[PDB]
Amino acid sequence: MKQYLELMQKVLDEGTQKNDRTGTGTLSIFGHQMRFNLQDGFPLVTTKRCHLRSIIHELLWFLQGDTNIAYLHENNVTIWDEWADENGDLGPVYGKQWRAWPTPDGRHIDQITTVLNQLKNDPDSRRIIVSAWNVGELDKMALAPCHAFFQFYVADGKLSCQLYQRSCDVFLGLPFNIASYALLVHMMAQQCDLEVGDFVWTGGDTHLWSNHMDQTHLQLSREPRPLPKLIIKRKPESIFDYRFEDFEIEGYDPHPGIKAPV
Amino acid sequence: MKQYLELMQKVLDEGTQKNDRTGTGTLSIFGHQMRFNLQDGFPLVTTKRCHLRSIIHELLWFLQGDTNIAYLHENNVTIWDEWADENGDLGPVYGKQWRAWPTPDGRHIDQITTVLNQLKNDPDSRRIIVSAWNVGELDKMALAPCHAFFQFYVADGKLSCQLYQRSCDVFLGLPFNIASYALLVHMMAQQCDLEVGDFVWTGGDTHLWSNHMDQTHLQLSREPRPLPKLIIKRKPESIFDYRFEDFEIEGYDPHPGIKAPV
């Protein structure tokens, strides 16, 4: 997408060379923002072929409050494999915080149900927020959340959402994160009888791995294609009742995929 | 400042009517970002006279971990008076979360000393983060945190910071919030022997109250002046040992102050 390629170019243009614990190195910039009008089309990168299959499963998994990878395995989704422990556990990552954030006094907050109630009953609220950044449980997580928290907004019947992504792998991670949150907005909008508005992406430490430069220059040589259309085939009774098969994308016409190394 | 006035004009151009708790109405947009290179000058609005006085005390107060307004009263700062209960308490807002985030198992995390330790000993960390958004204690707070989450970043010996602000009163609140976090960056930079980098302001629901229109237009009719320079006149031996009198603004020649109703 134009905005996505613009960020890619920006990391090239003004990134600082850094090291990582792994000793691979990054070009990094700090702070960026992009806006995707979801009525323009579903924001799935076209300058390399991306696949929605794992994205959809991961989101459904988040929404169930699951942090064991068993479900992902049921559907051959291997994106979390290197981070899971022997039992398939990741600790209290995303889904657990979204659905059962533990209070200091032994209660649990379902932020997803909270936000639905807010979007329906108090759509003007300036505090419709989900946070995975549970400071008191970070040391229990396989990895501290990268997509750390997000805020919803309603105006003129349209639902928007802004994500703060504290750390972003531009090449591999971001196309996945963008489509994930766009899908969530569509589902939230459908459950609240709202139109889809904007997905706003905000980045903190935003980088390209030094081993993705070859791929990045290829992808930057390509002109974005028009975006596809997302179809949701059914209206489930709740945000927790979507199924993989409920989603179809139509008109997706990307440039060939670009494989990275690891 | 140029970016600040651009934002005012953006809200006039693109803002939609969005009611509120009080029924005054706002013109609102969702998602905005500004970058202030702190090397260029201290980002204190010059198109109306602003004053650091309440800003400094509030920030020293946050850094102390205090959520009772007694300190602010002792220093003739009234900005929190409408929100505090009879005992002067605001509940576990900013200061408590910054200095003593309660974990579910009885510990407290000092996010400020954590960030200090990271900036000094692990400056390339991609999670140098402070969160006020403690989902589990929102029900105890006088108000949900507005400046909810901030992240630091270090490149080439320079300290940057990005704030996420879920809700922003552009005319009254925003100049205050920008200078607040810019001050914090300068303090952290001094304590970590780093140069100041960028302050990145990111907004969620970013609005002008409808009864701020005449004020906004007055201000927009004025040409911004060169940025002032922050003079810190003493280097404390910890981030917690600043004093109100340590800070001076130099070369600040604003347009007249503009009074606006709450």
Apex CA B133: angle with CA B182 and CA B35, to 5°? 30
Give break positions in chain A: residue before each, C–N beyond 2.5 Å.
none
Compare CB distances from A16 to B28, B102, B156 and report the shortest one's residue: B156
Task: Give chain B positions within 8 Å (CB) of A28.
Answer: 153, 155
Q: Do A199 and A182 contact (CB within 8 A), yes or no?
A: yes
What gap in Å lies between CA B21 and CA B39, rounded to an integer? 39
Q: How far is B245 from chain A (nearest CA, A)?
A: 32
What gap in Å lies between CA A255 and CA B122, rounded to an integer? 40
Residue of chain A with shortest Cα separation from B146: A127
- Which method was used? X-ray
CA-CA-CA-CA torsion sign (A55, A93, A130, A199): negative
| Resolution of the structure in the document, Å | 1.8
Interface contact B104-A109, CB threshold 8 A: no
Q: Provide the number of CB pairs (under 8 Å) joining chain A to chain B.
A: 136
Task: Give chain A positions within 8 Å (CB) of B30.
Answer: 153, 155, 160, 162, 197-198, 200
CA-CA-CA-CA torsion sign (A74, A75, A80, A81): positive
Residue B79, token pair as written in the block: 């900005």
Interface contact B31-A200, CB threshold 8 A: yes
Apex CA B242: angle with CA B171 and CA B54, to 5°? 25
DSSP strands (E only) in chain B: 16-18, 26-37, 101-102, 108-109, 128-131, 147-155, 158-169, 195-209, 229-232, 247-250
DSSP code string of A110-163: -HHHHHHHHHHH-TT-S-EEEE---GGGGGGSSS--SEEEEEEEEETTEEEEEE
Helices (H), chain B: 2-14, 53-63, 70-74, 94-100, 111-121, 173-191, 213-220
- Pairing type for strands B195-209 and B158-169 reads parallel
Q: How far is B74 from chain A (nearest CA, A)?
A: 31
Query: In Å, what is the CA distance from A162 to each residue of A1, A130, A165?
Result: 18, 10, 10
Q: Which of B254, B218, B20, B107 is nearest to A127 (CA)?
A: B20
Task: Give chain B positions within 8 Å (CB) of A35.
Answer: 31
What gap in Å lies between CA A254 and CA B9, rounded to an integer? 38
A128 phi/psi in degrees, rounded to 5: -90, 90
Residues 6+ apart with CB under 8 A from B122: none
What is the three-class DSSP state of A14? helix
- Pairing type for strands A195-209 and B147-155 reads unpaired
> Which of A7, A162, A196, A201 best probes binding to B when mutated, by most B CB atoms within 10 angstroms?
A162
Q: How far is B208 from chain A (nearest CA, A)?
A: 14
Active site residue B168: no
Name the residues of A annotated as catalytic: 146
The whole-angstrom distance between residue A243's C-alpha and the CA centroid of its chain comes to 18
A223 phi/psi in degrees, rounded to 5: -90, 125
Residue A86, token pair as written in the block: 């022997």
List b or e across A155-194, with b for residues whose CB sees 16 or more CB atoms inside 10 angstroms.
beebbbbbbbbbbbbbbebbbbbbbbbbbbbbbbbbbbeb
Q: Do B76 and B86 contact (CB within 8 A), yes or no?
A: no
What is the three-class DSSP state of A21? coil
What is the three-class DSSP state of B55? helix
B166 phi/psi in degrees, rounded to 5: -65, -25
CB atoms < 10 A from the CB of A128, how many?
Answer: 26
Residue B143, token pair as written in the block: 């108000």
Residue of chain A with shortest Cα separation from B199: A31
Residue of chain A with shortest Cα separation from B19: A124
Query: In Å, what is the CA distance from A57 to each residue of A101, A111, A116?
Result: 22, 20, 21
Residues 6+ apart with CB under 8 A from B111: A135, B97, B98, B99, B101, B129, B130, B131
Q: What DSSP element (H or E) covers A168?
A: strand A158-169
**Beta pairing partners, A215:** none
Compare CB distances from B135 to A16, A111, A144 and report the shortest one's residue: A111
Q: Do A80 and A90 contact (CB within 8 A), yes or no?
A: yes
> Which of A126, A170, A194 best probes binding to B when mutated, by most B CB atoms within 10 angstroms?
A126
What is the three-class DSSP state of B37? strand
Interface contact B20-A124, CB threshold 8 A: yes
Task: Give chain B positions within 8 Å (CB) of A166.
Answer: 126-127, 129, 151
Apex CA A10: angle with CA A8 and CA A15, to 5°? 105
Q: Do B131 and A97 contact (CB within 8 A), yes or no?
A: no
HSE-CB at A233 with a 13 A cutoff on CA atoms is 8
Residues 6+ apart with CB under 8 A from A247: A52, A56, A183, A230, A231, A232, A233
Q: Which of B222, B216, B126 is nearest to B171 (CA)?
A: B216
Can you list the pairs that A256-259 forms with residues at least 24 positions away whose Cβ atoms lie under 8 Å?
A: A256/A48, A256/A49, A257/A48, A257/A49, A257/A50, A258/A48, A258/A215, A258/A218, A258/A219, A259/A215
Residues 6+ apart with CB under 8 A from A13: none
User: Which entry of B146, B161, B168, B192 is annotated as an active-site residue?
Assistant: B146
Interface contact B155-A30, CB threshold 8 A: yes
Q: How far is B155 from chain A (nearest CA, A)?
A: 7
Residues 6+ apart with CB under 8 A from A241: none
Q: Do A206 and A28 contact (CB within 8 A), yes or no?
A: yes
Q: Do B18 and A155 contact (CB within 8 A), yes or no?
A: yes
Q: What DSSP element (H or E) covers B107?
A: none
Q: Give me the domains of chain B, ranges plus CATH numbers.
A: 2-262 (3.30.572.10)
List b or e across B99-130, with b for residues whose CB sees 16 or more CB atoms inside 10 angstroms.
bbbbbbeeeebebbebbbebbeeebbbbbbbb
> Which of A150, A166, A170 best probes binding to B when mutated, by most B CB atoms within 10 angstroms?
A166
Task: Give chain A positions within 8 Å (CB) of B155.
Answer: 16, 18, 28, 30
Residue A22, token pair as written in the block: 């792994």
The whole-angstrom distance between residue B93's C-alpha and the CA centroid of its chain comes to 14
Q: Do A217 and A258 contact (CB within 8 A), yes or no?
A: no
What is the three-class DSSP state of B235? coil
Q: How far is B87 from chain A (nearest CA, A)?
A: 23
Task: Give chain B positions within 8 Å (CB) of A65.
Answer: none
What is the three-class DSSP state of B149? strand
